[PDB]
Structures are given as structure tokens and as C-alpha cells.
Design a protein around this nucleic acid. Structure first.
Lengths: 69, 679, 171, 241, 111
DNA sequence: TAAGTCACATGGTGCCGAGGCCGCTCA
DNA sequence: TGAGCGGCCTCGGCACCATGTGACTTA
């Protein structure tokens, strides 16, 4: 499932070429949010020592992220 | 054809159909393919479904694909970027279909690898970069870094499985470029997507269309079978991916290379690779000639590397060390069938009882691959060694109690072929003929070759020996001794008593040949009367029916032969002493004459069929008695009135060019004054 | 169950012919010893004639009750049909034996001539290989070759990724 | 978990000379070690011509795992039909470069080694006898597990294992008597007497010694960092002609 | 071999030639296609091309002082083209954060 | 400092339901 | 040519023993 499929998801959520580029940049930003959140989740899991992450880890990470945003 | 590029220049509906049918009949040339793809890519007035129909149905090459066609195609596979906006974007489905058509048919490897970063091309670029990587030096850590970076990159679909396939091919290819299996571990571990990627379909209807077009194309340039084999091996390379002043011999790629640097050629000590086994010239392109090149560069002696390799890989086969003792056995056979020193060394070190005990199948194969070509270096001592070897293998076969074991007979056939090779040369012919006599003595012993426990292997070896004797007797220019064509009476009467029709035919052939040789010899010698005894006994047993009146038959007086007939009950005692001592009374030739009689009845469309299942005088008389008025006018074989005429008419049909029993008919037509006119 | 009957009669007839052959051999050597005292060292030329009289007695008996069963075709006994099956499988493969033997003999002649040609070629090439003469900084060379490789690969990357419309093999 | 791949060598190659060429080719110094071991020290296993030559080639860079610790072990005896075999652990890509250099320098013929059933039993016998610094041999008992994968029609019996605990194995050995080959003399005859299975005839894929090693038909993987002398010797008699 | 015996009875130059050919082919490519398609520096292609050859020469020689500072605004599309090739390492300097040290990946290693 | 006991955290073999593609397969 | 059942088989979740190492104690 490519990034263009996520752009299709976003356009069907909101419903030419320049708006396609805008939505593609939006999909890239969404992937950046997910990657940063998962990186914070691993950082906190390694801080606690657990090999995997858990829902409370990533909930705390995303609350700390949205606190700054 | 000119219609194809005429339509191409016209395009610069009817034209499309004409191009399709002329491609399906002739196929385009490489400049024609260049012009067609150049016209198709640059314009966009042509429909895209017709574009993919063209690239899947019209592009049909005739010969080599030139480099200029690939360069022109590569110009069209690019994309508009910030440094190139004037050129229009080629449709991605057209690019993917063109790459798929490329699948259907050091710089260029990097060209195709840098085009692999395109997302839509990845489903067909991967076989090209697999097939380009043929040498370990082709791969490099920068290629691995780019492949891993694009593989683990998001936004792609086919990149994980296909790039895992690329990395698997690289791991199977180089065995270097420090370990990359953990990089494979970092990429997907599903074994499903690359499982579907490792087998690829090429639209076998289009493959058959190109097959027939290319078969219509150039003689001795892409024949159909080699094209199918090349396509099959290119697909199997994808399929089995689951598991400076002097020049080295590896880097030599063409026959032109060996000339100017033969005194500057360095042969390596990498014997296992160059002896264990493509349109590109590489190290494996000239792998066939490496074994001979070593023995030319280093003068022939029993210390060279191919000799040691053949000896070691044959000892591994004998000791059951190799898993598959059928991949290197043809290699050893091909190397050592020639090169007399190696074959003689193998014969001296392996043709004995000890290695026969270890594995008789591999010994049988190496006897088939070495013995028929061997010519000895030392004449003395070869005969005694071969008698010892044949005696050892004969005891080994006969102690088992199983008469199905045919290794002794098969190796005997091989050494008779060696004797054929020996007697083809005028020198050392006495050794070969004496060895032939020893083999005839071993073949006729009643341990394998009996009248109850049959062995057609021994009969085949015997008739092979008789064929070689007949072919030897026709050579006038060789002054061999007269005593080496007889085999003694004890073999000849025994094989006359044997009930094998092919063997009796071979014996008659041997008699015909040895009499035609013996006619210029004096009429009264030690062996002329021996041949006379042979022919009189065989004619009396075959046609005369006068066995009881003779002095002896096959060295046995007819009183015992009559006493066997006594106490031997026959249902009808009309003609008992002459019923079954003839051509129709021989055990090997009884039903054969009935088959011949039935075929003669069928050929003449006779309404009367010989109902009795035996041809004898009593049955013949009863058959004429039951249908006398029908026989008298018409409805049976013409020109026959008695049993002797029936036998002559049978002998006519055995002399035709349809049976392997020519020689018995010629024997009866030769040494019988009554039958001398039927020759 | 008929296949069991045919298999059974097959090993019975195998043991039958084996025991009859060895019985005939033992009977004849018993006659030889009983006429003599201990003469058992008979030569090969006499043992062979013993084998010959054994062979002619065997095939004479085979023909003798071949006369008994094939003279009048009853076409009802299954032994009769067994005889035609045995005969039609015996005489079927006779021509293919000699055909394969002749073809493989022609193959052997091809082996002989190919070996002679290769012996001549090896002799000539050993004679020529003894007439050739014997076989006889780089710090910046490897560096400039590495520079050449890097420059040409960068040239390939710049030609492809920029959309330049003339890709060619530039040395 | 260090898998040892075994390859035989057609010639007795001497490694104390020419290894500087390998050092120059690999741009790193290797730690070649020379030893002269005498493995069948028992009187019933032979008392003459028992000496072997043991080479321990080691691509030494760092010591964290087998990615930088792909060892090479060579064993040799000049009084044999086949004079040398090698076994190497790890998964580094430099190992096949070492094998290619060994071929192209010494002109040797190298083939992979496959173990038979009796060879695997003898290897399990060899891998418990441990040599001590006091020059004594100690049998360390391990709970073995013979593991079979038979091929039957319709895949009726895919696999079956025979687990033998440690104390039962030493009880069988003491029941047989004072012997130095416990598996071939006590364990396997007991299995044959009890269950009717001749494990030297059945398809035996691995015998697993719990915590020490688990040898297979084509590889030997050991928890211990090295391979003892008895296993190397039994492999050397395994490939003889 | 008979022919070679009859003939015989009676290198660095192409390496440097190919090096100079690659140099002049790169020069012609950059002075005719890439910079004119960039159409920057008020159509004064050679003035920008001198800096482009300086950066390429530093990249080929593997200069350790290469970074994002010496790349001008006109060379930003050229650097983006180089980055799209995936043939360069983009690593931020530990001593100077924010300065991305840039060098090509090794095209000659046989590890 | 060599050896031992300990819980601990990761490695690993075996097992099975879900589901997918394959593998002919037959009308 | 086209739908179609069945062995395969791998994903992966679970279950359990197996295992190597640091912390701590004993001598």
C-alpha cells in the first residue's frame, strides 16, 4: 500500500496536479508524525528496559508530543 | 520485411492491422524496432490500450538486439525532472509493459540498477539485474547500499520481496562483500511475496509466437531448441534462488585472446572450479577447453592437475563420498576417454576386484567410458591382467547366485568394443584376437549362459564378438594367423545347440564369413575340415532331417539322440523321427516360421489359413488332406506343393529386407546345391 | 487371484528347471564316478560336451512337448494362451537388438575417429607449446582506476536521474 | 550456537608457510595456532601413528560474536588416504575468500562432508570424552535425544524422536561396563533390544546433547566456542576411502 | 596458434585516455545540458560551472571538508539531483551540528 | 579469586487455526 | 477454456522447556 494510496484515502476523506502534490506532502507529514511517535515509544520503552512497546508507552509519548503542539 | 517499416513511415486502423499481421508473419529488424519504439514513445495520439497491445503483440525481434536499441529504449524509460521538462512523460503502464517485453527478450548493469529505483518498473527490472550479474566482481557494497535503501524505503510495494530476491541472488553469486544475510533479515520475512516473485510468467502464447517467428528467421542462428533451453535456464536461475602484464586463464573470454598471450598465460591451481560447470563471454564461456589447456600448457605427465582431479573424484565416487555420483562421472569420462596416460592409469588402479566390491555401477560406467577407447602402451602383460580382471568379475557375479546380475556381460561387451578398436589397427591385433578367444571361452560357460536360465546379455556379447569376427575376416590386407578365427568346436556346437534365433543368425554369418575367407586357403588343413564339420552338422540339424543317418551331430553320435526320442511320448506317431529336426523344428525357429507363413498368407490374401500351430510333414499332409479341392485350384501360397517347397518359400521371406534373420537364409542358400539358385 | 497363480507357477517353474538341470548334472557325474573309481578331474573339453548333451536334451524336450500342445489348437486351455503370449513377447524385440547394436557400433567408430583427431591435435599443440618463449609505479595506477570508476558511475547517475535524452556507453 | 561446516581436503597442505600471502590479501593478520595432538590415547583405539596436526586459523578482529569470530580448524595426518579436512564456524563472507585462496594457492580439491548414521553415533561418542589439563579423559554425561525424520508413503510418519535422559544414559553405560564409546556400545544396542529399531539403519537427522552440542547430517553446532579433538579425529576417519 | 607463430616469427595510456575522456565528457555535459537547463546565474553558465566543477572535484577526491555551506542557491537543484541518485552520505557533523557533511559512497570497495 | 546458587530475560522448538496460492482437475 | 477441491504452507500467536549472563554468596 503506497503513499499514493494514503493520498487517495485523504482525498476521499475530503470529498488538480497541484492539489495532488499538496496531499502527497500531507501524507509525507502524516508518515513523519507516525515515525516520530514510534521513535518516542521505543525511547521510553528502552528507558524502562522493555524490548517491545505497549499502549500506555505510546499514549504517554503522544500526549507529550501534543503537549508541545 | 519492407511492409513493416513502410507502415512505420506511413505512421510518421488498416495500418495497425497490416503491422500486426506482418509482425505475426515476419517480425521486425533491430532498426525497425528502433523506429517503431521511437514513433510509439514520442507521440500520444495512439491509444494506450493499442500501445500495450503493440508492445505485447507487435514487437518481435528477428536476430541480435543491438546496443543502440537498448540505448534508445533507455532514453524513453526516463521521467521528467527539474533538469528536463521539455520532454513529455512516457506513460508508466507503457514503461512497465516495455520492461516486461524486455524480460520476454559493467556500465549497463549500473544503468539498469539506477532505473530500479523507479517504483512502477520494479516488477520487471529485477530479472534484468539478476541476469546481468553473472560474475562475483559485478556486485559491490554501493550496489548493496542502494538496494537496501530502496528496499526498506516506504511508498513501495514490490521493493521488499523483489529486492530480497536480488540480495539472495547476490549472496548465491559472490560469497563475498561482507555478510548481507542480516540485511535480508531486516527486509520482509514472509516467504510469500518473493515466493510469487521467484516464479514469473512470460505469456507463453507470445513466447510461442516469437518461437515460430525466430524459427522462420535465420538458419543456424537461434534454432528453436536452444532458444527454449536458454529461456528455460534464465527462468530457472530465478526459480532456484531459494538455495596485469600476464593474463589468467579465467579472464580469457574468446579464442582471439589465447593467441597473443599464450607465452604470457598463467594457469591457476583452481582445478575444482574450472572442471565443474550464455551470450556473454566470461570465465565460464570457455570452461569446456580448460582441461585440455592445462595439459597443453603443462606437458603431459602423470603429475598434472586434471589427472589428479579425475583420480580423486573417481575415488570419491567409488568410496560413496559424493552425494550425486552422476554429475562428475560424465566429466571424468569425457576427460579420460582420450589422453591415453590417464585412461591407462585409471585401468591400472581401478579395474580390479577391490573397487568392483565397493561400487559396481560406477565401475560399469567408467568401463563404458574408458575401455572402448583405450589403446595399450605396453603390449606384454595386458592379456594376463585382463584375464585376471574378467575372471575376478566373473567369480564376483557368479558367487551371488543371482543370474540377473549382468555386470560381467556388460564389461565383456565393453572389452569386445576395445578389441574392435584394437583390430581396427594392424598392430597388436594378435593380442586383441587372443583376448577375444578368452572372452568367447568365458561367455559360453554354463553358469550364466544356459538352456534353462537364459541370459540375453551373454548372447548380445557373443553376437557382438561374432560380428567383430565377421568384420575382421573381410580385411585382406592384414596377414593374421589362420588359427585366430576358429574358436574351437566346443563353443560352436554349444552355440548351435542354443535356442536363440539372433545368435544362430550370427553363427551362420560367422560361418559364411570364415568360408569366404577360407576359399583361397588350401582345401585340406587342420581347420578347413573343422569348418566343413561345422557346416555339415548345422545343415543336417537345420534342413536335411538326416540326423540319425549321420556319423555324429555336434560331436554326439545319433544312437543317444535316438534313445532320447525313445520314452519321449508324442501324441501322433505318423512321422516322429523327422517331425522336429528342421527349420520349423528348431526351438528358436519353430514359431518364427509360423509367423512367416501367416504373413505370406496375409500378403497373398489367401482365404485358407494354416490352422495347425506347428509346421511339420504330418500337419502339412493333413492340411492338404482336409482342403484338397481348395488347395488344388486357388487360395494358398503359389508355387508350393510339398513341405520342402514350403521351407524354400519361407526362406525367401527370411531373405527380405525386413528381418534380422538374413544370415540363416544366406547360409542355406550358399552351402546347398539345391538352394544355390535362390541366391 | 489369477496374478497370484501366475506368480506362483513362475517361481515353481524356475525351481523346476533349476532342480532338473542340477539333477541331470549330478546324474551324469554319478555315472562317471560309478563307472570309474574316483575320476572326477575331467578336462574342460569333456565338461563342455557334457554341457552340450545337457543343452540338446533340454531343447529337445522343450520341442518334444512343444509338439504335444501346439499340434491341435484347442484354444480353450489357458496354458495354450500362455504359450502364445510367451512367444509373441519373445519374438517382438529381436530386430531392435541388432538395430541398437549397429547404431552403437557406428557410435564407437565415431569415438575412434574423434579420439584419433584429438590425439593428433594434442600432439601438434604440445609441439607448438614447446616452441614459445618462457613467460617473463602501480600506487597511482589503482588510485586513478578508482577515480575512473567513481567518475564514470557518477556520470551514469547524472545521465539517468536528470532525464538526459542520450544515454550511451561512454568509456 | 556456532554451526561448523565441514570440508575435506585432497592434499596435506602446510599452513606455517604462505600465510603471509593470505594476510596481505585480507589486509589483516590471522592468528594461526599449531598443535600436535594424539587423540586415540586409549590402548584399544590404537597405540601407533596416532599423532595429528591441528591448525586453528582465526580471522581475529574483535570478540563479540561470530560475525568477527569465524574460526577455522584444520586437522591432518600424513599416514592416511585422505590427509586433511577443515571445519569452520561463523557466517562471515571472508570465509569463502579464504577457501578460494586455499584452493588457488595449494591446488587442493575440496568437497563438503556428509555424515552417515554410524558416523553420527561415533561423533556423539567423541563429543563427551573431554581431555583435562592433568592428561586424563573425562566422560561428561549429557541427556541425548536421537531425532529422526523418516520418509514414508502419504507422509504417514513424518518424524519421531528418542529422548534419553542423562542418568539413564550413564546407567546404560555402567550396565554395559567400563567402555569409552557409550552410545555405540550401550545406548544403541539397548534401543535395538527394546524397541526393535536399528538406528544405524533408520534415517537419523540429528542427535541432540542438551546444553553441549547437536550434530546433524551436514553440520555440527556447538554451544562451546571450539571443537574437541575426538570429534575432529572421528570426522577424519569418517572421510577415509 | 600457427598464425600467431608466423606473426611472432617476424596499459596506462588508455587508462589516462579514458580518465581525460571522462573529464571532457563531464565538462561538455555540464556546460551544454545541465547548467543551461538550470538556466540560472543570468545565463552566465560558465561562472556557475566553475563552482560546479570545484564541487565535483572535491567529491571525486573525497574532500572531508565538504558540507552544505559551499553549495549556493543555484547548486541546490544540482545537490537535490545528486541526493535523488542515492550515491551520497548525508551525515550531520558531531562537532558542528546543523552542518551536514557530504561525500559520495565508495564505488570501488570489494569487502 | 574460583566456584556455586539464584532469578532473570531472551532464545527456541513444537503446535495450530487462519488463509492464501497452487496443482492439477475435470466438464 | 473455467471453476474448484485438496495438499501445502507460512503467518503468528501461544505454550513450554531451554539458555546464557549478571548479581550475589561461599571458600
Amino acid at each position: 500500500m503506497d503513499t499514493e494510496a494514503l493520498a487517495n484515502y485523504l482525498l476521499r476523506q475530503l470529498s488538480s496536479s497541484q492539489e495532488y502534490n499538496k496531499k502527497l506532502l500531507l501524507a509525507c507529514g502524516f508518515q513523519a508524525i507516525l515515525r516520530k511517535i514510534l521513535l518516542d515509544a521505543r525511547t521510553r520503552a528502552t528507558a524502562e528496559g522493555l524490548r517491545e512497546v505497549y499502549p500506555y508507552h505510546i499514549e504517554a509519548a503522544t500526549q507529550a508530543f501534543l503537549d508541545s503542539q | 520485411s519492407l511492409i513493416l517499416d513502410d507502415i512505420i513511415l506511413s505512421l510518421t486502423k488498416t495500418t495497425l492491422s497490416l503491422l500486426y499481421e506482418k509482425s505475426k508473419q515476419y517480425g521486425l529488424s533491430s532498426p525497425q524496432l528502433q523506429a517503431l519504439v521511437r514513433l510509439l514513445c514520442e507521440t500520444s495520439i495512439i491509444d494506450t490500450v493499442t500501445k500495450v497491445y503493440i508492445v505485447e503483440n507487435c514487437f518481435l525481434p528477428d536476430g541480435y538486439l543491438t546496443k543502440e536499441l537498448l540505448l534508445e529504449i533507455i532514453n524513453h524509460l526516463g521521467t521528467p525532472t527539474v533538469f528536463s521538462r521539455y520532454r513529455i512523460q512516457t506513460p508508466p503502464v507503457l514503461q512497465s509493459a516495455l520492461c516486461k517485453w524486455l524480460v520476454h527478450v559493467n556500465i549497463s548493469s549500473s544503468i539498469w540498477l539506477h532505473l530500479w529505483q523507479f517504483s512502477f518498473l520494479q516488477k520487471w527490472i529485477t530479472p534484468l539485474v539478476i541476469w546481468q550479474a553473472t560474475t562475483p566482481v559485478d556486485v559491490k557494497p554501493w550496489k548493496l547500499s542502494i538496494i537496501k535503501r530502496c528496499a526498506m524505503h516506504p511508498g513501495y510495494r514490490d521493493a521488499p520481496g523483489s529486492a530480497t530476491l536480488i540480495l539472495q541472488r547476490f549472496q548465491c553469486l559472490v560469497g563475498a562483500s561482507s555478510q548481507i544475510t542480516e540485511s535480508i533479515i531486516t527486509i520482509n520475512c514472509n516467504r510469500k511475496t518473493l515466493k510469487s516473485h521467484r516464479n514469473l510468467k512470460l505469456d507463453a502464447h507470445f513466447l510461442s509466437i516469437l518461437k515460430r517467428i525466430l524459427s522462420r528467421a535465420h538458419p543456424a542462428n537461434f534454432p528453436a531448441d536452444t532458444v527454449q533451453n536458454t529461456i528455460d535456464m534464465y527462468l530457472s536461475e530465478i526459480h532456484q534462488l531459494g538455495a596485469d602484464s600476464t593474463v589468467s586463464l579465467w579472464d580469457v573470454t574468446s579464442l582471439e585472446q589465447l593467441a597473443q598471450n599464450w607465452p604470457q598465460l598463467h594457469i591457476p591451481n583452481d582445478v575444482d572450479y574450472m572442471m565443474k560447470p550464455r551470450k556473454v563471454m566470461s570465465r565460464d564461456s570457455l570452461k569446456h577447453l580448460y582441461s585440455s589447456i592445462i595439459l597443453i600448457k603443462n606437458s603431459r605427465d602423470e603429475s598434472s592437475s586434471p589427472y589428479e582431479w579425475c583420480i580423486w573424484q573417481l575415488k570419491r565416487c567409488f568410496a560413496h563420498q559424493i552425494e550425486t555420483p552422476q554429475e562428475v562421472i560424465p566429466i571424468i569420462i569425457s576427460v579420460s576417454s582420450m589422453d591415453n596416460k590417464l585412461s591407462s592409469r585409471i585401468i591400472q588402479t581401478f579395474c580390479n576386484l577391490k573397487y568392483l566390491k565397493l561400487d559396481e555401477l560406477t565401475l560399469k560406467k567408467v568401463c563404458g567410458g574408458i575401455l572402448p577407447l583405450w589403446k595399450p602402451e605396453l603390449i606384454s602383460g595386458t592379456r594376463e591382467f585382463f584375464v585376471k580382471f574378467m575372471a575376478s568379475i566373473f567369480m564376483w557375479s557368479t558367487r551371488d547366485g543371482h543370474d540377473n546380475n549382468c555386470t560381467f556381460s556388460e564389461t565383456c561387451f565393453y572389452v569386445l568394443q576395445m578389441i574392435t578398436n584394437w583390430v581396427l589397427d594392424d598392430k597388436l591385433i594378435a593380442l586383441g584376437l587372443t583376448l577375444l578367444h578368452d572372452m568367447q571361452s568365458l561367455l559360453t560357460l554354463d553358469k550364466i549362459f544356459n538352456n534353462a536360465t537364459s541370459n540375453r546379455f551373454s548372447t548380445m556379447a557373443f553376437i557382438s564378438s561374432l560380428d567383430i569376427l565377421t568384420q575382421l575376416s573381410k580385411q585382406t590386407k592384414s596377414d593374421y594367423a589362420i588359427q585366430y578365427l576358429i574358436v574351437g568346436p566346443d563353443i560352436m556346437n554349444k552355440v548351435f545347440s542354443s535356442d536363440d534365433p539372433l545368435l544362430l543368425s550370427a553363427a551362420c554369418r560367422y560361418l559364411v564369413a570364415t568360408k569366404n575367407k577360407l576359399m583361397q586357403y588350401p582345401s585340406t588343413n587342420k581347420f578347413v575340415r573343422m569348418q566343413n564339420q561345422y557346416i555339415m552338422d548345422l545343415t543336417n540339424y537345420l534342413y536335411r532331417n538326416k540326423v540319425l543317418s549321420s556319423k555324429s551331430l555336434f560331436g554326439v553320435s545319433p544312437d543317444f539322440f535316438k534313445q532320447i526320442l525313445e520314452n519321449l511320448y508324442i501324441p501322433t506317431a505318423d512321422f516322429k523321427n523327422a517331425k522336429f529336426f528342421t527349420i520349423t523344428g528348431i526351438p528358436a525357429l519353430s514359431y518364427i516360421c509360423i509367423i512367416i507363413l501367416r504373413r505370406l498368407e496375409t500378403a497373398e490374401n489367401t482365404k485358407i489359413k494354416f490352422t495347425s500351430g506347428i509346421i511339420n510333414e504330418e500337419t502339412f499332409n493333413n492340411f492338404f488332406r482336409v482342403h484338397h479341392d481348395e488347395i488344388g485350384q486357388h487360395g494358398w501360397i503359389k508355387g508350393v506343393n510339398n513341405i520342402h517347397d514350403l521351407r524354400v518359400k519361407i526362406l525367401m521371406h527370411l531373405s527380405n529386407t525386413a528381418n534380422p534373420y538374413r544370415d540363416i537364409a544366406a547360409f542355406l542358400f550358399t552351402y546347398l546345391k539345391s538352394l544355390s539358385k535362390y541366391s | 487371484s489369477s496374478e497370484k497363480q501366475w506368480e506362483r507357477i513362475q517361481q515353481l517353474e524356475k525351481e523346476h528347471v533349476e532342480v532338473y538341470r542340477e539333477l541331470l548334472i549330478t546324474l551324469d557325474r554319478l555315472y562317471l564316478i560309478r563307472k570309474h573309481n574316483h575320476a572326477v578331474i575331467l578336462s574342460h573339453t569333456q565338461q563342455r560336451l557334457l554341457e552340450i548333451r545337457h543343452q540338446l536334451q533340454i531343447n529337445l524336450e522343450k520341442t518334444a512337448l512343444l509338439i504335444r500342445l501346439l499340434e491341435k489348437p484347442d484354444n480353450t486351455n489357458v496354458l495354450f494362451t500362455k504359450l502364445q503370449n510367451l512367444l509373441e513377447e519373445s519374438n517382438s524385440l529381436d530386430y531392435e537388438l541388432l538395430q541398437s547394436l549397429g547404431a552403437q557400433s557406428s557410435l564407437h567408430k565415431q569415438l575412434i575417429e574423434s579420439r584419433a583427431e584429438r590425439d593428433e591435435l594434442m600432439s601438434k599443440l604440445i609441439e607448438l607449446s614447446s616452441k614459445f618463449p618462457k613467460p617473463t609505479t602501480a600506487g597511482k595506477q589503482v588510485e586513478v582506476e578508482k577515480e575512473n570508476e567513481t567518475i564514470q558511475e557518477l556520470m551514469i547517475a547524472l545521465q539517468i536521474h536528470s532525464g538526459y535524452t542520450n544515454i550511451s556507453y561512454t568509456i | 550456537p556456532y554451526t561448523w561446516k565441514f570440508l575435506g581436503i585432497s592434499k596435506q597442505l602446510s599452513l606455517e608457510n604462505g600465510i603471509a600471502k593470505l594476510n596481505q590479501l585480507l589486509n589483516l593478520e590471522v592468528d594461526l595456532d599449531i598443535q600436535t595432538i594424539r587423540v586415540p590415547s586409549d590402548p584399544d583405539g590404537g597405540t601407533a601413528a596416532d599423532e595429528y596436526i591441528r591448525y586453528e586459523m582465526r580471522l581475529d578482529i574483535s570478540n563479540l560474536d561470530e560475525g568477527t569470530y569465524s574460526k577455522f580448524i584444520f586437522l591432518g595426518n600424513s599416514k592416511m588416504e585422505v590427509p586433511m579436512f577443515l571445519c569452520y564456524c561463523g557466517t562471515d563472507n571472508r570465509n569463502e575468500v579464504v577457501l578460494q585462496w586455499l584452493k588457488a594457492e595449494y591446488g587442493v580439491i575440496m568437497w563438503p562432508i556428509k555424515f552417515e548414521q554410524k558416523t553420527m553415533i561415533k561423533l556423539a561418542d567423541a563429543s563427551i570424552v573431554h581431555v583435562t589439563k592433568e592428561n586424563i579423559e573425562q566422560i561428561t554425561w549429557f541427556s541425548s535425544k536421537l531425532y529422526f525424520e523418516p520418509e514414508t508413503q502419504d507422509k504417514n510418519l513424518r518424524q519421531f524422536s528418542i529422548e534419553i535422559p542423562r542418568e539413564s544414559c550413564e546407567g546404560l553405560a555402567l550396565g554395559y561396563g567400563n567402555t569409552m564409546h557409550p552410545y555405540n556400545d550401550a545406548i544403541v544396542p539397548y534401543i535395538y533390544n527394546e524397541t526393535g529399531m536399528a538406528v544405524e539403519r533408520l534415517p537419523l537427522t540429528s542427535v541432540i546433547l542438551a546444553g553441549h552440542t547437536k550434530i546433524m547430517r551436514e553440520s555440527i553446532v556447538t554451544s562451546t566456542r571450539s571443537l574437541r579433538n575426538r570429534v575432529l579425529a572421528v570426522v577424519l576417519q569418517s572421510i577415509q576411502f | 596458434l600457427q598464425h600467431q607463430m608466423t606473426i611472432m616469427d617476424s596499459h596506462i595510456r588508455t587508462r589516462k585516455a579514458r580518465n581525460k575522456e571522462l573529464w571532457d565528457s563531464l565538462a561538455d555535459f555540464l556546460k551544454g545540458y545541465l547548467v543551461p537547463n538550470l538556466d540560472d546565474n543570468d545565463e552566465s553558465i560558465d561562472s556557475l560551472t566553475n563552482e560546479v566543477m570545484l564541487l565535483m572535484k572535491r567529491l571525486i577526491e573525497h574532500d572531508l571538508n565538504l558540507t552544505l555551506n559551499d553549495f549556493s542557491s543555484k547548486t541546490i537543484p544540482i545537490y537535490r539531483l545528486l541526493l535523488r541518485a542515492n550515491i551520497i552520505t548525508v551525515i550531520e557533523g558531531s562537532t558542528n551540528p546543523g552542518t551536514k557533511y557530504i561525500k559520495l559512497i565508495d564505488f570501488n570497495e570489494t569487502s
